[PDB]
Amino acid sequence: MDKFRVQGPTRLQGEVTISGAKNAALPILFAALLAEEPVEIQNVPKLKDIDTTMKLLTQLGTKVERXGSVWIDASNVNNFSAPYDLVKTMRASIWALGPLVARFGQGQVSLPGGCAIGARPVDLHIFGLEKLGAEIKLEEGYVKASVNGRLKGAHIVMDKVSVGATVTIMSAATLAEGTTIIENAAREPEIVDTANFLVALGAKISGQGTDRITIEGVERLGGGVYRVLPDRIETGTFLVAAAISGGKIVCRNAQPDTLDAVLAKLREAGADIETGEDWISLDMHGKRPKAVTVRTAPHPAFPTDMQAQFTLLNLVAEGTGVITETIFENRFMHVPELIRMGAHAEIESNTVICHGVEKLSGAQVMATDLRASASLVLAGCIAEGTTVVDRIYHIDRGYERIEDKLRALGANIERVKGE
Template identity: 55%
Template sequence: MDKLIIEGGVPLRGRIRVSGSKNAALPILMACLLAETPVRLANVPRLRDIRTTLKLLNILGCESEFEENVVRAQVVLLKPEAPYDLVKTMRASVLCLGPLLALLGEARVALPGGCAIGARPVDLHLKALERMGAAFELTSGYILGHCKKLKGAHITFDFPTVGGTENLLMAASLAEGETVLENAAREPEVADLANFLNACGAKISGQGTSVIHIQGVSSLHGCEYRVMPDRIEAGTFLVAAPITGGELEILDCPFQELDALVYKLREMGVWVQEDGERVIVRRDGELTGVDVTTQPHPGFPTDMQAQIMALMCVAKGAGSIQEKIFENRFMHVLELVRLGANIKLKDRTAVVRGVPKLVGAPVMASDLRASASLVLAGLAAEGTTEVQRIYHLDRGYENIEAKLSAVGARIRRAPE
C-alpha cells in the first residue's frame, strides 16, 4: 500500500492536462456489452476502476485490450453473472444489470461496493426495470433478475439517480417500444453515455435534460468514440492553483460543465477565465469563505465538496457547506483538522472558518474525493504532509502526482 509525501507551500505554475472521465468511461464500457461488432474507445483514463471493469467485462464474455488510453472491446459469448470478488470493489459494476437483462433476459449481479460515503441503494434501478417487465429477488448478496423481453415504459424516478438513469438508458435501447425517463439525472456523464449509445445506433433524445426519450431498436453496432474529459479532475485542478497561490493553464477542461463550481470560486476571489482551448485560474487577491450546498447537476457537485472545503480552510472569514447527496461525506473533516483547519460539523453541515496557514501532518484518506482534498490541503500546508491509503485516489485520478510534479509540486509516492 502506497502513500503520498508532500512538501507544501509551493505555488503551482504551468500547464496541466485533464484526463478522460472515469464516471463517463465506466458506464460506456458497460454499454459495450450491447454492441454486436467491435468498439474502440479513446481518452479512457488508466485507473484501477477501469481495469476492474475490463476484468468484469472479460468474465461476462466481452474481450478487451487497453493500450495508450484506448480500449478495444468485442463481445464473444455473453454470460449473465457478475461475481462478488469484482463487484465488491466498485459501485459501477451494477451497471451491467440493464445490458444483461436486455440481451439475455437474466442477470446475477452481486450487490455493489465502492467508497463508504453513505447509502446508495439500487432500489431505484430495480423499481424502474420492473416497470419494463423485469422481476428480481435478492439472495445471498446477489441481485437475481429475469424477464422475457423488456418493454418500453413511462418511468418517473423518485430522485434523479445517475446510475439508475444510466442502467435504464442501456436497457431501454434494446427494449420493445418507447421508454420515457422523467426526473432523469442531467449529469454530463449521463449525456456522454447516451451519445455513445446513439453512435452505436440507439435512438435517444433529451439527454442532459430531466426528460429522456428512448426508442428501442433491434440491435446495436460498434463504433469509435472519445470519452469526455473528467470534470471533477478539472475541478480539482481549478482549486489547486488558488490554494497554493499559483496559476495554472488547464487543457482539455470541460469548462461549460463546471458552472456551479466556477461561480463559487469566483465568489471566493478566484480568477477563472476560458481562453480558447485552455482555462486559466489563479488567486485574485484575498480568498473569502462562501456558503455551498451540494445538489444534483447542474447544482454544485458533491464530488467537489471536499476540495472546495480544503480551499475554504485557508480563506478569510467563515462559510458553510451543506451536503445533501451523501450522508457520510464529511469523513475528511477530522483529517483536515489534523492539518490545522477550523471546521465545526453538525449533522450534514460543516462550518469552515479560515486559518492563516495549514501545517503538515500524517493524514488518512477515507474515500476518493476526500483523498483529493487532503492532497490539496497538503500542497498548501507548511511542512510535510503524508497522505495514507491513497488507493482511493488511484481509483479516480490518473498519475496525479506526476501531473502535479510537472507544475512545481513537491510530491512523491512511497510505500507505507
C-alpha cells in the first residue's frame, strides 16, 4: 500500500498547471454515446476512472483511444449493456443509461454491492427517465431502461438537487421529441461544461448554471472537438497550499469564475489574490493566515470538496474559526488525524471549532476521503518533521500527479511502497 513520506516545513510557492476536471470529463465521456460522428475531448486528466470509462465505452461498441485528449467514435455503438466487471469500480457508470435509451431505445447498467441506485424513495435518475417516457426495471442486479420509439420532452421537477441525475436527464433530453425543462437543476460548473459539450455536438440547451435548464430535443447529434474545463477543486487545493505556507502561487489553465466563494474566503484569510482570463495568483506575502468562517452549501456557494482543505487552513491560522457542513455533516475524518499532528479542534454536531496553532508536527496519518487525504499531504508539507500519509492511492484517483506538482512548488515528498 503506497504512502507519501513528507518532510517539513517547506513553503509551497511557484506555478502549477491545473488539470481538466474528472467530474466534467466523466459525464462528457458518457454523453459522447449520443454522438454519431467523431469527437475529440481535450484536457482529460489521466486518472483511473477515465480508463475504466474507456473500457466500458469500448464494450458498448465505441472506438476509443487517448494520449492529452480522448478520441471517441460512437457511430457504431451496438451493445447496450454495461456489465458488472466493467462497472464494479465506478458509480459513474450509471451515466451510460440515459444516452443509450435516448439514442437506441434501450439500455441497462449493472448495480454492484454498495450501489444505491433505486434505493431512494425517489431516485432522480429513474424519475427523470420515467418522466421522459422510459420504463425502468430493477431486476437481476441491473437497472434496465426501455422506450417504444423516442423519449418525449417533459417538465421535470427534481425534488432534490442532484448533479448525477441532472446529467442523466439533460443528456437524454437532447434526443427527446419536444422540450424538456429541468427545475431545481444542479448548478455545478461540471453541469455547465457537460451542457456546453452537448451544444457543441448540435444540442439545444439553455439555462445551464441556473436552477432551470431547458432542452429542445433534436433528431441526432454529430461530432466536434471540446476542451474539458479546469478542475476547480484541484485549483483550490493548490491555492490553499500557498495560503497555509506563506507562499505565492500562480495557477495556470484555471477558470476563476468557478471559484468565487473559495477566492472570497481566501481573501478573508488574508490572501492577496489576482485573476486573469486563465490564471489565478495567490500571495500571502509571508504571513500566517487569519481564521475564517466556512459554511458548505450547493454551488455557487462554498464547496464541500474544499472543506477539509479550509479546515487545515483554520488549524494553522491566527484565531478561532468554525467549519460548518450543510452537505456532508460528518465529513470530518481529517480532524482526528490533524489533531495527532498537533492541531487543536472540537467537532460539535456538523461543525468543527478550530483553534489555530503556529506549527504542526509530523505524524503517521490516513484518511480515505480524497480531499481529506490531500489535505494531510499539505499538512505534512508545513509540519515540523516527517509525516507519513497512508493509502494515497485515494489521492492518485482524483488528482493527476499531485506529487510532481507539489515537488515543483518546493515540497519534499517521496512515494514509498508498503512500509
